[PDB]
Symmetry: D2
């Protein structure tokens, strides 16, 4: 419980770095006056309780926690669905890490009407001890989907996994609303490029 | 071109100080596991081009641009429509400045402590919902791309997007209400 | 003890606000002359120190709001004379009230969620040289648990003296430069 | 002019990334409850003027300023003189860049090539990394200010007090390494 804080140190650092790196993209794009594919970036280090519980369910032995793919997380947000593929292509082309193949959250991507996506990278962190490779999960969401996802996450923690029938249905409604807001935005960015 | 950067100095510092003041509000809620009415906060100093451009329209003489209310601006994003009202109530109650006579704005007179002494600078505070702000952002961009004259086909999709954002908020408020049926 | 986090909220916020305000002084100059401020730091006194200081000074938990340094800011200067200037700036500001080294305490009026709340804040002023020594004295006085062994204490005293010297030297550079 | 502003984009970004990478070092130690070789890290993009000033001085051809090694500069500050070689070596050991080609040994400097990922692919950039002791750097600062104020020619009355100050700073370093020394016998 105090060897935890020590264990995670490399995970913060990689977060702080990919954070500043990813944030450079928007800045570069701000000089073209061209539309930035990136609205903003956030990151987080998975909490101990989140990590242990996820181990539980994924039957990940405790000496193999390093296999967990989201101890270090970043989240890239965009205005437009179509921005995601752009961002994905940028991340594949980058050479300061490498994309780890994987096929997870296939239902989550789909249920969200493909407004939430993600890919895992192996990042080569320079340690005092030398070099330490760490998994980093990079989410890619629309602003709209992320709004909805945030609310779902709160209530889901508020009722500890038991969202009342009444509230679930209003939350489903909210989801479709968000999904629709994107619909109309994609049609905006669509109508524009008819230039 | 740089006597400007001298004019703008007390505005940047007003924005920076209020930025960290208002960001404190969400911080005071984080340990409650009670809901933060403020989701996040941004600020900007008005671009020197925007100032002259605006001084044109509203017929503001150069010697009175200090009466322009938004040289310094903050913007407060809220999750729920109901939050905007809670935040406005908070701004009116704060003593570290004074208020001057889905969205909202007010103007404060912020007493900026300087090296020369005390200086009151006007600051515009905006309060939006996330959804509202997303739509308003695209509207602003386009309103620049098409230089103030947006094509008709685009204008419609903008109107529909606007209405899409409002449903999202309305749905959001009913979650909020139904949850408060506890 | 989760009370601590809840308790220290207003102190972090006050330190955060003072931090941005004091760092504004250096900004104001480096556009107009020599800034009397080099850099600024701030810290919320950690829970362990609060408790140990409280024992030392024999303060009960229902008064630890009387401890002057639960919020602390530290302003660093180049020149001894600079400190005096900052001293007066601080005394001239209205967004709070006052109640080679130097420290004052302010009562900062924090706008809380439920109303106002005046918290004490300690502001230290130091030359860059004095601070560097002080850092070490603190670190060693830590690492050695408050009994620093003499073979080290005398060395610290020399560093103390070395630094004092260098400020003497720097006061003079300022003195000669001002003969213009 | 905005030829510059856009030209300086990759430099601003590279300073920001290395700034975060280097601040990890002090973090990693100050967690371990060890002593940290790095006290703090700063960084600068060379002002447009200083690139033109340094232009004429070193017989530049403005078509090749990208040969100028300190457009993007970082500076690491250490408590002790012994830390500097400790940093210098951590710096030689890293794989996210490659190291390339008065005050005594209280100040070092080196130049890295930084493999910057940009929107249109890779761009290697030279970044200068000065390592100094706190004391060293404090005198350098006043030195740099006056050398600038008096346009490269300092009044002999002031140069003297400078040399004196420089000796006071150097002695301070000597007392500090004696401290670290007697603590290294624990
Ligand atoms: N990649 C990421 N970027 C930013 N924030 C993230 C993130 N992943 C999670 N978070 C935040 O971290 C908290 C807890 O962990 P999780 O959301 O469950 C990450 P996950 O691995 O994708 O889901 P999981 O833990 O069920 O496996 C949440 O507040 C969430 O919003
Ligand atoms: N109060 C505020 N807080 C934060 N950002 C603001 C703001 N007012 C404007 N902005 C942002 O500043 C950018 C453009 O600035 P401006 O056009 O000069 C101010 P404005 O919103 O147009 O008011 P204006 O119409 O009276 O001129 C936009 O990105 C806009 O979203
Ligand atoms: N304005 C400030 N006042 C006090 N400490 C400050 C400070 N700014 C930074 N610090 C630092 O915060 C760190 C924590 O030290 P503390 O545990 O609070 C002991 P202290 O407060 O310095 O002495 P004290 O308990 O006798 O009052 C120290 O390294 C200290 O120098
Ligand atoms: N590598 C570095 N890291 C951080 N700050 C630096 C730096 N090199 C210079 N600076 C700082 O940048 C400011 C001005 O630097 P400049 O004069 O523009 C380039 P210079 O290195 O000082 O001269 P030079 O052309 O001989 O190389 C000074 O405050 C200086 O201390
Ligand atoms: Mg995950
Ligand atoms: Mg405005
Ligand atoms: Mg103290
Ligand atoms: Mg140099």
């Amino acid at each position: 419980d105090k060897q935890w804080e020590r264990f995670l140190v490399p995970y913060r650092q990689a977060v702080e770095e990919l954070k500043v790196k990813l944030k450079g993209i928007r800045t570069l794009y701000e000089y073209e006056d061209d539309h930035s594919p990136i609205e903003f970036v956030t990151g987080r280090v998975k909490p101990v309780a989140s990590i242990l519980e996820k181990a539980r369910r994924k039957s990940i032995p405790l000496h193999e926690i390093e296999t967990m793919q989201d101890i270090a997380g970043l989240r890239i947000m965009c205005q437009f669905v179509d921005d995601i593929q752009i961002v994905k292509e940028m991340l594949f082309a980058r050479k300061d890490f490498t994309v780890v193949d994987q096929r997870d959250y296939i239902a989550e991507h789909k249920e969200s009407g493909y407004r939430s996506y993600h890919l895992v990278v192996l990042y080569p962190l320079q340690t005092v001890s030398g070099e330490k490779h760490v998994l980093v999960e990079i989410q890619i969401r629309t602003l709209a989907m992320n709004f909805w996802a945030t609310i779902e996450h709160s209530l889901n923690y508020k009722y500890s996994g038991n969202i009342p029938e009444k509230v679930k249905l209003r939350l489903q409604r909210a989801s479709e609303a968000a999904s629709r807001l994107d619909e109309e935005m994609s049609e905006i960015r669509g109508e524009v490029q008819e230039a």
